[PDB]
């Protein structure tokens, strides 16, 4: 619907299509195009619900690396070892927060 | 298995696939795609061991 990029695949976000990652390249560009895809939906919940911007996500261990390995602020393109999140589930399932949101 | 990238080489990580290094280019982009492969497994040992 309104969160598509017009040439997108409608319900999947796959890092190998340049329209989904916005023309992104290698990793820091690619994953940071998730963090925009994950904003664009947390916004669109504010339109449908009329309550508020998307307040949480739940997600597989794989995307939580993609969240943990990328600079989540506004900076250039960065990658590395998964840092700010609890990527494993033993200690706890709750892993970090994104940008305090 | 769960640590694959659907087009990868299934048991070897070779820096010459565009799929494995995540479309990385030159080195700093490329070698940082290892560090993400070594995380993706180090996490997956938390799933199998518990």
């Amino acid at each position: 619907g309104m969160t598509l990029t017009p040439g997108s695949k409608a319900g999947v976000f796959d890092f190998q299509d340049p329209i989904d990652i916005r023309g992104a390249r290698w990793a820091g560009e690619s994953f940071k195009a998730l963090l925009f895809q994950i904003d664009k939906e947390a916004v669109e919940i504010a339109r449908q619900t009329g309550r508020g911007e998307g307040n949480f996500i739940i997600a597989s261990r794989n995307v939580v690396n993609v969240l943990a390995s990328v600079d989540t602020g506004i900076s250039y393109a960065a990658q590395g070892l998964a840092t700010g999140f609890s990527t494993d589930t033993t200690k706890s399932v709750f892993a970090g927060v994104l940008g305090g949101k | 298995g769960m640590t694959l990238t659907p087009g990868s080489k299934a048991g070897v990580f070779d820096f010459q696939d565009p799929i494995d290094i995540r479309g990385a280019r030159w080195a700093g982009e490329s070698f940082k795609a290892l560090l993400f492969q070594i995380d993706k497994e180090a996490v997956e040992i938390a799933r199998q061991t518990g």
Binding site: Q16, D17, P18 | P18, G23, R25
Partner: peptide, 25 residues
């Protein structure tokens, strides 16, 4: 369509093929 990541060394070859009168690129 699809997506194949090719470096500029293939595009250096391709811009050398068609600018030297070759037939495919």
């Amino acid at each position: 369509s699809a997506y194949i990541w090719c470096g500029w060394w293939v595009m250096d070859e391709i811009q050398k093929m068609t600018e030297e009168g070759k037939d495919w690129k």
